[PDB]
Amino acid sequence: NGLVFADRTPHPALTEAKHQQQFFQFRLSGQTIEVTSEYLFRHSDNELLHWMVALDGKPLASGEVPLDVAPQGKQLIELPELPQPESAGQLWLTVRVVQPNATAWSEAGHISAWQQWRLAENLSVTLPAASHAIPHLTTSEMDFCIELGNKRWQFNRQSGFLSQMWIGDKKQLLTPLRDQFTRAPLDNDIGVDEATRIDPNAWVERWKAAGHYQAEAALLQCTADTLADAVLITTAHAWQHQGKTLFISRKTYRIDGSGQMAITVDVEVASDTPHPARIGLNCQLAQVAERVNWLGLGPQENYPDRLTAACFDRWDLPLSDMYTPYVFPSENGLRCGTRELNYGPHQWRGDFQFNISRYSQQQLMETSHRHLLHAEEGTWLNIDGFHMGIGGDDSWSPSVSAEFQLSAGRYHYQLVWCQK
Amino acid sequence: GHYQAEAALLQCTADTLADAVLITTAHAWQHQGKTLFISRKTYRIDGSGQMAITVDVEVASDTPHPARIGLNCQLAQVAERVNWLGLGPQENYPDRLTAACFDRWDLPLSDMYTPYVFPSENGLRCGTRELNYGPHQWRGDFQFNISRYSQQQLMETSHRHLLHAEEGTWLNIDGFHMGIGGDDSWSPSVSAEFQLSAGRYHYQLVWCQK
Ligand code: NA
Ligand code: NA
Structure with missing residues (x-):
């Protein structure tokens, strides 16, 4: 009934558990990302937010913002004006929380959280x-x-x-x-x-x-x-x-x-x-x-x-x-x-x-x-x-x-x- | 721009088949350089006199979910009765239909209109498999309303006593209709499972003369 195989290889279900058990929550309003900490004691002193906007998988713009959130607190990140394309498809925004430094339990560059939203969609009208x-x-x-x-x-x-x-x-x-x-x-x-x-x-x-x-x-x-x-x-x-x-x-x-x-x-x-x-x-x-x-x-x-x-x-x-x-x-x-x-x-x-x-x-x-x-x-x-x-x-x-x-x-x- | 969105034609072909004529169309509703909806249809008129309409709609994920996805027209006929196989007998909506029963219902046309004092969309019946009005019969799985009042007259007039019966009968046949809500009446109250958010929609209708 494991999340892992007997040899400790992950079952696919483990990644769902990791995502749902995230310690940061996100909302998107307009161009603002609201990041809320679900930690009770620690500040986010080993965390950075990576953002990426892509059109049907094609990277258009990306960035990095340091995270400085008090336990239970919030940080607002304002996205730069996004250089919208004209071509048809769906724009997707992805964010990831990355741990720059190694810990006793993780390697450098460890991903602790992510989230996606649909941004603008341009329907295909051209025959x-x-x-x-x-x-x-x-x-x-x-x-x-x-x-x-x-x-x-x-x-x-x-x-x-x-x-x-x-x-x-x-x-x-x-x-x-x-x-x-x-x-x-x-x-x-x-x-x-x-x-x-x-x-x-x-x-x-x-x-x-x-x-x-x-x-x-x-x-x-x-x-x-x-x-x-x-x-x-x-x-x-x-x-x-x-x-x-x-x-x-x-x-x-x-x-x-x-x-x-x-x-x-x-x-x-x-x-x-x-x-x-x-x-x-x-x-x-x-x-x-x-x-x-x-x-x-x-x-x-x-x-x-x-x-x-x-x-x-x-x-x-x-x-x-x-x-x-x-x-x-x-x-x-x-x-x-x-x-x-x-x-x-x-x-x-x-x-x-x-x-x-x-x-x-x-x-x-x-x-x-x-x-x-x-x-x-x-x-x-x-x-x-x-x-x-x-x-x-x-x-x-x-x-x-x-x-x-x-x-x-x-x-x-x-x-x-x-x-x- | 939903209310002032203009239909722009993309495609309109005709083709003769072994026993039918097939009309294929595509349209785009745009507002100020933005494509809101695309409608792709086929009409198949066969030898038995039935017209089968197949409709496939795309809604841009970033436009507010629409109130309905359907067709409308003004029929020339004014008949006495409306006969339907579906939910009734009274007005019912996707998030207010538990009280309605599935059966064969037959009402006078006037009963198919609800006289709200501030006029609005009204008289819808859901889960309908067959609609009968004069010589006309529509079969499928749809919601509909039928009255002497256009969706335009209803939204433009502020009191019910100021409404005039138009010429003929306005028919609305919807494949999908937004919930009405009402948890309160001063904020958006329609629950997520009753908002038309799927992005792609499909319904089919057979129109014939019985
Ligand atoms: Na940090
Ligand atoms: Na009105």
Whole structure:
């Protein structure tokens, strides 16, 4: 149940605890930062505030101000006039409290606190430059095919899913892109303190009994249309278990002359089915790259009810860091609030949560120990419009608070897939 | 600049499909060089006569959260009854709807207006899946109000006895509507979970003739 592994390597949860247990609080009013000390005895005599303003990860301005706060006291820091850019995006302010000097318990340059705020946002009004190229649709009995030069997109008309993508003669997918509504259960979803308890109230059990893990997709609609400058595929799927419809998924895929595939997803969830762990898509990619790079919350694993410690910026990590090696395997390594994701030739833009690794949700839920996991061929990608909270208040009864359960009934998310 | 914000057209294409016409639009509401909202829509008129409207709105994170995200128009028809599947029968709002029940409700048009002495937004009904008015039917998941008074006349007139019924019927269909609040009435009282702060919004509507 540790914040650390037996060898004292941090679990991702530790960083959330560090952030929430901060000894300095911050408010932002206009250009003023108010820093309040939660110490009771010490003045801030080994602390400096670093501030940084960035546009979608791009550093615009930064600075340093010494901290001189009495225990329980306040210091107002006035920011210099910020040299606003004209280009579209969201400006983010980040502050960090840094300890310049080593102590008996920390190294020089130790970070004790941080915080972020959204500053100005400039919405993108300027149209994209109209591409000259135009995609073409090749219909067969079994498939819709879209080609754009080297690029090729294949929609299986029997299943209703994007079954394959081609760059010239190279395959991009090892498994089709399908809706996913389940996760490999966390310890908080399993809910039991004792071994032989088959607790009928736990999330995994409610999910198992409703047939979430074994629901079969049934195709309702799979049509293709040609527009002036794009091809539009439209699909509708029903997930059923024992005649009962749990989820309906309605999708458009819009492929334009730029080679961008725009996916719209609208999901209905039956109000009497237990709230799903996630509402997303997954596929097994053929590529295995070294680095994952994203504009979103990071660097560490973060979930909707555990993301306060994560900062929004441009993060770049090795693939292996995008997996969390919990001894008992589960859904893991998610990052939330992501606007852009980069992996090998692929780029996904939108507002989504994702995890990426060499292990399928299936392998993760079938394996009892982490050392028994084996890297699957290619890379498993889950991209979620929505993900349920993880809970934790205890680990033997449902603990995901109401506001983090997927209860809306109707959900919408949109993704742009392109090959940069 | 929310009240004086002017719609600027970005896109307006038409496309013929196998069994439908697809109109795609984009707009930006600006005030003094600042982009407040972007609205992206598709209209799909198919062979059965139904028009499906899909709306996706962006709100700048640094503009005050808007009062509503919706559509309005003035219908030519003045009918006797309003029939809806949703929350009712009385006026209800996102942070004042626990008393309302989900059912099929049928009231005279006049009942769809609440005569507050100082006129304001009024008569909203939430959680509506189907709205019927004369030959018109709207389906989806929306909030609406319907009356002879425009949002403009309501905000310009100071007493209820000075209001005149306009020509036809003003319809407001909202995908999202701000809470009313009221913990007090001299400071912002709308709780955070009832402010339209998501940044991106989505609703869909089917309009047909029954
Ligand atoms: Na100091
Ligand atoms: Na008024």
